[PDB]
């Protein structure tokens, strides 16, 4: 996870405009609609029978916030993703057994969500900066599976 000062600035600048109460819930929700099997890990959230039900599920929106928060922690410690996410890594690998690939999927979904909300502002270079960050969070979380 090596970001040039220029990317660090653009990533920080953009994230400043992110809606911390929504983006996370939208990304988690899209993860469950685009890759249906991920719902298996969240069967206690209630109704996930349809896209609209998933996107409108309170529990999905609430949990999304935490996810975004963690990503935020990461953006504040790109110097030590592995360390920042040591706890989550044990939760997802040792306790939940989520396959490492799903971490990558959620990461790309988030990138899709960001592109959706900022449109033309989410330029090719900015995306590149972000692909690095989500790749780091994922690899850090997969530390107990990698």
């Amino acid at each position: 996870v090596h970001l040039t000062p220029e990317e660090k600035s653009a990533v920080t600048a953009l994230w400043g405009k992110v809606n911390v109460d929504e983006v996370g819930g939208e990304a988690l929700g899209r993860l469950l609609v685009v890759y249906p099997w991920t719902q298996r890990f969240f069967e206690s959230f209630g109704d996930l029978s349809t896209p609209d039900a998933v996107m409108g599920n309170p529990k999905v929106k609430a949990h999304g916030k935490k996810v975004l928060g963690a990503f935020s922690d990461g953006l504040a410690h790109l110097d030590n993703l592995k360390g920042t996410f040591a706890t989550l890594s044990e939760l997802h690998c040792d306790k939940l057994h989520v396959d490492p690939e799903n971490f990558r999927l959620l990461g790309n979904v988030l990138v899709c969500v960001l592109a959706h909300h900022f449109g033309k502002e989410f330029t090719p270079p900015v995306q590149a900066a972000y692909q690095k960050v989500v790749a780091g969070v994922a690899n850090a979380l997969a530390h107990k599976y990698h």
Partner: peptide
């Protein structure tokens, strides 16, 4: 796919 939602891995 619909019911058990088995992960493809």
């Amino acid at each position: 796919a619909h019911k058990l939602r088995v992960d493809p891995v």
